[PDB]
Amino acid sequence: MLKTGVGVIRMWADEGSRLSRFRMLFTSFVEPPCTSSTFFCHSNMCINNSLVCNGVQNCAYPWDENHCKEKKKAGLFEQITKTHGTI
């Protein structure tokens, strides 16, 4: 968890080990007093609300990827299909 607005990542891999890999994911955050255009993952972070239900988790625990995709409740109505709905 960096303290500045500039972060630099390098990868020194020599001749005999060019198969190594890593996939990082940075996320900008401001220390909270959380306001409008903030979300407050509860871990000393205000993140932008574009990062909420982004599909990809951006905080430590997925507080942003929570309470999303809660489609309507169904039952025997949508079970009327190619298999059950013919019977």
Binding site: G75, L76, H84
Partner: protein
């Protein structure tokens, strides 16, 4: 309504209207269900179903 699936509650009620329609047709098609509701006095062409 929880101990039976909503597939089953429809299939009972569809069979409840189903067997009711079959038992109505199969009683008119049968000759044995035709008789007289007046057994006291003899026959005067009073042969009558009940269904």
């Amino acid at each position: 309504l929880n101990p039976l699936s909503p597939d089953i509650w429809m299939y009972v009620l569809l069979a409840c209207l189903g067997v009711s329609c079959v038992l109505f047709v199969i009683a008119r098609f049968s000759p044995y269900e035709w008789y007289n509701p007046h057994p006291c006095n003899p026959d005067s062409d009073v042969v009558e179903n009940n269904f």
